[PDB]
């Protein structure tokens, strides 16, 4: 082949975190929501198999799996923590997935709610024709 391909796809990782009007019985002071998505409502499901959100051990059923959009977790809690995220690809070769450490931080009562956005670029060199077709639908 004379030809070669590099494909780039953009992901957005983010979260919202808000102080509750009233704490929960466990003493969870905050509502939050973390997510993985494409920018401008683009459809990353063409190439994403699933998104795994690994919550802090203090949460029940800490491995949260989303096989279909929206890839998000909504929860309540009292403290910020590092939240590993795995994005799995509909790829039959390497790489099968990419891993991020997401910083799920909360702000103190009195400060505006958290609305955080983290942009990530993924680059795939010479994907298979099957995977390439999926990436370029997104």
């Amino acid at each position: 082949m004379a030809s070669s391909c590099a494909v780039q796809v953009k992901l957005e990782l983010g979260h919202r975190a808000q102080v509750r009007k009233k704490p929960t019985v466990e003493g969870f002071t905050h509502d939050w929501m973390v997510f993985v998505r494409g920018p401008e409502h683009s459809n990353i499901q063409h190439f994403v198999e699933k998104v795994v959100f690994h919550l802090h051990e203090s949460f029940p059923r800490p491995k949260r799996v989303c096989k279909d959009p929206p890839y998000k977790v909504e929860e309540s809690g009292y403290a910020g923590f590092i939240l590993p995220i795995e994005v799995y690809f509909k790829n039959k070769e390497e790489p099968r997935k990419v891993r991020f450490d997401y910083d799920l931080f909360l702000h103190l009562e009195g400060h505006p709610p958290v609305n955080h956005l983290r942009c990530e670029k993924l680059t795939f060199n010479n994907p298979t024709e099957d995977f390439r077709r999926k990436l370029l639908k997104a």
């Binding site: 905050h30 802090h56 403290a79 910020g80 923590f81 590092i82 931080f105 702000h107 103190l108």
Partner: peptide
């Protein structure tokens, strides 16, 4: 800092 405490 604006942040709450953290857990680990």
């Amino acid at each position: 800092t604006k942040q709450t405490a953290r857990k680990s």
